[PDB]
Design a binder for this molecule. Structure first.
Ligand SMILES: Cc1nc2ccc(S(=O)(=O)N3CCC(CCNCc4ccc(-c5ccccc5)c(Cl)c4)CC3)cc2s1
Length: 329
């Protein structure tokens, strides 16, 4: 069978906490009063939930309500527990309240209100510095949640809110996040195709925080190269093919050998033989202002098949790409 793996960092953080910290099935949800919030307008619809702007009539504060679609109670408890554990952490969305409709029995998460700058506006105007700054802010949230024993497992642009006017950022949608325990086999059917790590695609279940670092690398690539999505797979199999056409097949097969991974016979037809490509082939006159030796070195050190060889969040934060942003703090 496959060779086991443990996180290189924050390995045992949960083992040292009281069981209640991570044993979310035991968590009893503290309900607030639904009548405290009036819905104002729909903001979005999102697979597991519908999102509204609302107002707390107790105090006239603007709030955001996520009305959950039917999910298992255990997965709701998981998300709530994680949100509560991470509350106060840098750039983590703040859960303000939890309410249920007395009639429809539907449950609703109440968050802090954060405005999002118009995507068209923001993207038009970004700048190399801005990307470094916001990437650093995301890394602060990931180092924090990893240090708290939690993997996000769905890092991607949709789950990053920015308010450019106030230089503010939040990592949202903790609904797929899970506690890391050494030895645990996790579900590989998580995260969106374009952001799935090789570990998920080859069905290596004993993964860890480092999954998030792959996803982050995918985000960085899409931003500096102005290509979304960067790895555009047609399905889960082709997703790995797209990766292999860039990172090359030699290192992929080395990874599968090292962990004694058994590959679906299908991959053995489609994967073929691919050299490792240089990042320069994605650079053009439109994106060159975003692309630097530092950016490429950083990218290279996130996008690695072997989850153990990817940068940690804290290592990433020390990378030369961020020197000027850190100097500003
Ligand atoms: C508690 C909660 N409150 C709200 C409030 C509104 C909503 S929403 O459903 O209406 N909607 C979700 C989708 C957002 C778009 C995500 N931004 C993309 C982005 C992300 C990152 C970047 C980026 C990345 C790296 C460097 C620089 C910028 C860049 Cl360039 C762009 C808008 C808002 C849900 C929640 S959940």
């Amino acid at each position: 069978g496959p060779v086991p793996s443990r996180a290189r960092v924050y390995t045992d953080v949960n083992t040292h906490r009281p069981r209640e910290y991570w044993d979310y099935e035991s968590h009893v949800v503290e309900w607030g009063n639904q009548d405290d919030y009036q819905l104002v307008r729909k903001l979005g619809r999102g697979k597991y939930s519908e999102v509204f702007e609302a107002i707390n009539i107790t105090n006239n504060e603007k709030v955001v309500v996520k009305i959950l679609k039917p999910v298992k109670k255990k997965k709701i408890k998981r998300e709530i527990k994680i949100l509560e554990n991470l509350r106060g952490g840098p750039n983590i969305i703040t859960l303000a309240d939890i309410v249920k409709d007395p009639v429809s029995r539907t449950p609703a998460l109440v968050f802090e209100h954060v405005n999002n700058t118009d995507f068209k506006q923001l993207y038009q105007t970004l700048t190399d510095y801005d990307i470094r700054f916001y990437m650093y802010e995301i890394l602060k949230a990931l180092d924090y949640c990893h240090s708290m024993g939690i993997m996000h497992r769905d890092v991607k642009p949709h789950n990053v809110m920015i308010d450019h006017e106030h230089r503010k950022l939040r990592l949202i949608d903790w609904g797929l996040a899970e506690f890391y325990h050494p030895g645990q086999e996790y579900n590989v059917r998580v995260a969106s195709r374009y952001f799935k790590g090789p570990e998920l695609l080859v069905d290596y279940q004993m993964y860890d925080y480092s999954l998030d670092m792959w996803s982050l690398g995918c985000m960085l690539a899409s931003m500096i190269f102005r290509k979304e999505p960067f790895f555009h797979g047609h399905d889960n199999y082709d997703q790995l093919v797209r990766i292999a056409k860039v990172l090359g097949t030699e290192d992929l097969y080395d990874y599968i050998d090292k962990y004694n991974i058994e590959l679906d016979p299908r991959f053995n037809d489609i994967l073929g033989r691919h050299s490792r490509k240089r990042w320069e082939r994605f650079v053009h006159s439109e994106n060159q202002h975003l692309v630097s030796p530092e950016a490429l070195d950083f990218l290279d050190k996130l996008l690695r098949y072997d989850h153990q060889s990817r940068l940690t969040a804290r290592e990433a934060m020390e990378h030369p790409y961020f020197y000027t942003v850190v100097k500003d703090q």
